[model samples]
Target: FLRYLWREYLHPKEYEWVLIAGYIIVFVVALIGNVLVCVAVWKNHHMRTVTNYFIVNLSLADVLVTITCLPATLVVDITETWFFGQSLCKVIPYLQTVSVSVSVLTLSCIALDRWYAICHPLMFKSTAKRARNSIVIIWIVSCIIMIPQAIVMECSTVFPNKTTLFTVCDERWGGEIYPKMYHICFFLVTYMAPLCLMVLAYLQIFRKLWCRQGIDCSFWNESYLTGSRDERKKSLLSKFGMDEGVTFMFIGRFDRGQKGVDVLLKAIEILSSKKEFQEMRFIIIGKGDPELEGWARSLEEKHGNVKVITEMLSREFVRELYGSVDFVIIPSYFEPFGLVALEAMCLGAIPIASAVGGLRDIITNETGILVKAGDPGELANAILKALELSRSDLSKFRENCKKRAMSFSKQIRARRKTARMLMVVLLVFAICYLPISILNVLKRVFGMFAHTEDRETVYAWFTFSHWLVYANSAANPIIYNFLSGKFREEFKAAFSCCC
Candidate 1:
């Protein structure tokens, strides 16, 4: 009898392995992912907000369907039998449809919350209490409405007379309109209502959020679309930017040839027209020469992905950008020594630099990517290549960047020694000019007494103090013109030896 059952009814079809794997995959992942969502929310107090509450509610609905419906469906589909007891025949299908209804309802609640909060900020208050109360109502409505589905479920035999029979679970309602009405209502609540309500509400929410109410005569400001900013992540770009995905930052003086804002913009310009354009976001940060600055402004104006911030942000915030961004792009046609690359690299942002000047010196294979200096096409492709790395791979690059930065930390220390020369010039200017400064203040106040001997004494002090001021101004030129005699004599002798 067991052999007979295996031979006749229990064998899976050719494509059934695929179907089996799919069920298990969906089952495990859906269960794990949703439970993780709920677990994270439950464990983490910071994630406990009205929106997150709504998210967890949706996850519960998902978690509900996975355990009850998935295994039952997978078993019945593979074996062509309802192997579970008769009671589950009534319950699992009811729960499956119930889960979907609650999921849709939860989504609608999220949509309504966002819509009210974003589009009509002052109109109503959204609170955790209201969200929890609304959640109970969603379940209540979902349960009561799906009762019709439960009422129709019954288990019966697939082959009525056979001793080796398979069981099937199905609806047994008799009235034509009862089943018809239930199915119609089910489709409306689970699919159609959400398709219209939740989907459309979210559309408007984003429209408000992205500042793109292009529906008609938004009539607000043409300039409104041109800027992107906020106090948080949005502030990373300017008036607005991203909570999106990978962002590439370009920061330097907006000199077209030297900094390559033009090529960077051109790379994005080409990308914005390409299919892969949506893969990443762009930030242009610098006050440029008028022409390049205008090009940056126009680029931000035209493309939603690119944002221009001409304002010189604080270095602390700029370094914050370096720490947070995925990649810093320096398409400089000629870099004297890429400080931008060095800065970002130290902060663990992988840089995509045009292989010119100091960039070629720094970006080794393990540290960062180097492309041709002015090639926009290749630059876009390099950025497109950016998407191929996994999180672990990116982590590896970050570690590599940190390592390389330490290798280059020697240069920072080297520059510290170099800055002593600047300190000399600065100190000389201050020290030499203070005497003249004090003498002027004294003469202006005391009004230079007219007695011959006293006047002559003040005049003598004034003449020498003014000479000190002139000598300080000339030191820049004085040092540059071979540092008087020590470097001067050495320079001629060194050239004579080379000669």
Candidate 2:
């Protein structure tokens, strides 16, 4: 009786329909969930992190499991036999094994990546490209490892005397030893190994976090000390006059490709040639272009007034430099928006820029001088003129520069403009929507007592106003493009598929 009950339970004699329904639900839910994850990643660009990329890969593996493995397994459960024939019998189990392997391996990869990002922040920089390459390699290795599953899968002839011969999909290793060894080895390599690594990685990550936050040790205390020192330095510098000799400041990369190095070299030559400006120290702060570094060193040797700082500078030190400097020189061939110029102006440093790109919009005669792109003589002359200004004139120019900087500030320009435009859109929407709202309320309050002619008039206008509100929605993008030249160009380029 026990044997009979066991056989009936395994075969699911009366519960076959319920089992089928359950399997269908499982398949549909799994398919939808995994597909939705992929869709979310596709729609949102910011969601395209290394971890999320691995998640998408894992979802793809699960999707393959649902499409290939789940259906085949369900069919076998319902029919109590394999009806998918010889080709699929060989293919399905292989795909199933590969999919499972890929899923586990991807999860392991994600764990290791997070571990590195947290525990080894300075040593490891995980990128989406690296994650993508790793995922491809994982799938390839999984396929190779799952080849044996396909090879061992065959319709069994163990039940030979039965009238209706049933094909059961099982391993055909020809011996118990081989089958046991294969199962053991497969479990260790695909499942146990990745699981162990993921556990170890997570453990280390948690341990590191605990040490950094919970534990009070000398090693852990060092990071906190370093961070505290940076904040303290900024606080101290803001109160004192630490920056003194910096007259003209050049900030950013020293790459000749951007025309910065050329501009600096020409300024150095012209300043050295002039006696009045020869005393003025040009503080070039940043690092890039080994050739430019060498040239700066040579210029420093030839003229003692030129200072080339190659080391990494803190933001506080840069702020101090900006505060002390007389002028911030931006002689780029093409500068868009001129953020450095604005930064200098905010710090009471006047700008002396080339008359190019956004610099034209930023620099006026009252705020700063405009020199030619590659002309050192004009820059030197501009320097002399700046130096020769009276104290009152310099004070007035500083105020003008500050005002201009405030006007062109990113927070003010972008957010303020966007806010105003959005308010306009909202106002338009309100104007269109308010009448319908009041009319509906009035009709309801009057116990739906409007005549047919008045009802039709109200309904027609309501429809028009509803569409007008939608038209306001449509106009927002157009209005934003009209207000923002950069966004307009970007939107156009994106639509044209040129970028």
Candidate 3:
């Protein structure tokens, strides 16, 4: 039985010998490279991020497809029939579609997650919980979604009279309707919609990471500013002592997560009790939940100075508001973006934000201050910290804020460097492998009927280019080390640690 199996399946025909070699090259690379990815991620605690988790998922899928699907594909391609029996005929194709779905969904998850982190920070947090649950859902949905594939699959001997066993596996759905609807549904989830979303997400990510904000890096231009801007900032409110000397402003929704108005109210109460209200005034704005609004107005009464406006104000009003306000407070647990602070910087308002989400990105240094999120005590301290700055100290920060805001205004870039490297890598790939692809494709279409040392020479070149293709995969890790800043460090670290 072992000898018969070996003679039947393991033996290669003349033309198929080079083809088998080509398959072998792919087998070695796909198995080793993908396994390397899985094990590297598995062993390294550092690589166990939600991002790498998806990568590992993808790699595992690749390994499985390589193992289960590749041999069947090779067999069908060479022998023109199926030999793996009815169960696999159903299961193998089903698994292939499952893995394909898993691949797309996994990548989609990664793309959107990354987009949220970069293009829209503070919106959706990526956690291990989210990732693990996501992976499970992907596998489950993948299997269930493609289940009809297995049901429709059937195996039969094609032209049984000619060869005794020209077995073929095919879908046996009664009509075109099932195929039509299933493909439409599959295409939507697997490629079309996910790909569109991915492209949009990546487009923004590319812009966010690459497009430079036009800094005009020349000397500061005061041309855009209103002449009366700083003149309007003159401390005129000192006419009444309890009226509040410095303007401290807070503007956000009562969503509670992003606005953290609960923690904000706590900070305000702490400061008000400590008589910190005498130094600066708090004007908070937002309305979504009834409880938050209740707290908003309750805090409104708590401090004659702490004014809460439930109504949505116009941008013009906020612009004017920031114009006069010395400091804007954003007490957020998370942020999608720090446009609030950016706009504040437009009018020389320095922000004091809870050091979370997009707030951290914008208010890094010189522009504004960032304290611990949900830490009302810390926020009060930061508020007091801002108040401690003298007029000169305040001017530097405020001036720097305008400058920094302008930096982000039209400015953006970093991805291009890596993009440049990636393009080069792709060039190397195309150069390395495209020749064989060209030969294999055209010869089949344009030259298959047409051969002879021409066949030998052609086979030789095909083998040559096929090897080059595998070499591309082999050289990928090396190329990445040179091009990828982080990949080099971690890849090296992982290898060195493993050794």
Candidate 4:
């Protein structure tokens, strides 16, 4: 059995440079990209949220994929044969398979979260509660999903002849029906299922966002200045204490995990109790809660201050509201892209956000204030800081906010940086395999005229090329380290969070 396996993969001088180049690229890219993701989440307080915590776990698996799996692989590729005894060769690839599988599963989970938030916003919030248990459960499922690859496959490294100085790494029972079965099992879990889920999630999310674009003037519609509406708006507005010309605006939903509504509610209550509210009015640019309405009415009855209005405002109104308001707040729990804060910055609103999720990528002390998540006292203090600045200081705050907002915009600079990082890693797989795949297809058409061959000939001719492709994965991150600022920034920062 060992001798039979030996003759198959031990074709000396077959791959040469292709093998070395491939493994180096794969390991380097996976190492650098995953490390950067982990570091960025850990070092930035703004990224220290439940969702990002899971991202760190995902990055961890990939880091192991590059480090533990690639060095052995590179060695195997350079010699044009697997040198490790059969046991180690199989063991290494199996481990690498598990790591890759976990990464696909983790990204699938992230896509699901994005789908729920965008497509079925209300239904998603009720059904898909983003709890600590849920995050842990996903990891558990990923582990279970990866177990079969470790159990079913076999690996070995053996020499063809004593004098050849060449070794071969071949899958166990690969020439028989088992290799096909193994491929079926792995392909289903790693490719087919994840692809289906990602496609469905993104499709739904895009549809929902598209539908939202058609809605008429509908962001915030309640007025606080003219007649009965103005009186009502004024009564609610007085809670935060401001002059007649100022309006507070908010956009988005309160559906539980949408943007830390639960935490924002808690913070707002704490702010309402502060002695500072004895003087100002804060306009809420978005929807009002009925329970919050009750609180506002009580404050209204005391003639205190705190307003709740159900106004249907337009996007332009929202823009104006941000421009004129004393401050804008976004207390999100797990934002992938904190667009709200960025929008506030565009309109020159002094932004205050709960330090969580992707908000860290956008908001800094240089541009806006960050309050501790789920803490009311901290939020109120942040509010006071925004309100305390004199008119001249406030004008400067607006300037800084706009400048920072422009900096992170996908249109100007951030997207290009991000694209460069992703492209460096992606270039290898796309370039190496595309023409190979095309050639494989053409060969299949001509195979009908060729003499009959056993399963070994069929499998060997098809997959050996990809072995070189797999090697390319090891070198990707090294290129990224030299080319991308974002990748470098995140990689250097990874140690702080994971350690």
Candidate 1 Cα outliers beyond 4 Å, as residue runs: 1-4, 158-164, 212-499
Tens digit of per-residue lDDT, candidate 3, span 413-459: 33344444544543554466457545644553344525453655665
**Runs with alpha carbons beyond 4 Å of true place in candidate 4:** 1-15, 49-51, 78-80, 122-148, 155-169, 173-179, 210-499
What would the TM-score be for candidate 4 when compared with the true structure?
0.46
* lDDT top scorer: 3
- Where model 2 places Cα greater than 4 Å from the true spot, the runs are 1-12, 121-126, 158-162, 210-499
Q: Which model, 3 or 4, shows the larger TM-score?
A: 3
Number of the top-ranking candidate, with TM-score as the measure: 3
Q: Write the per-residue lDDT of candidate 1 for residues 385-441, one digit (tens) a residue.
A: 876662334777877976776666564443333233323433454466456545543
Q: Which lDDT tens digits does candidate 4 get at residues 30-101?
A: 666666666666667755644455556656775775677767755664445566775675577677766665
TM-score of each: 0.42, 0.43, 0.54, 0.46
lDDT of 2 by residue, 30-104 (tens): 565566556656766855777668767866886777777776776665555777788888998898778767766
The deviation in Å at residue 49 for candidate 3 is 2.1
Question: Candidate 2, after superposition: displacement of residue 329 in Å?
Answer: 31
Model 1: ten consecutive residues of lowest lDDT: 213-222
> Which model is ahead, 1 or 3, in terms of lDDT?
3
RMSD of each: 39.3, 22.6, 11.6, 12.1
True-structure lDDT of candidate 1: 0.66
> How big is the RMSD of model 3?
11.6
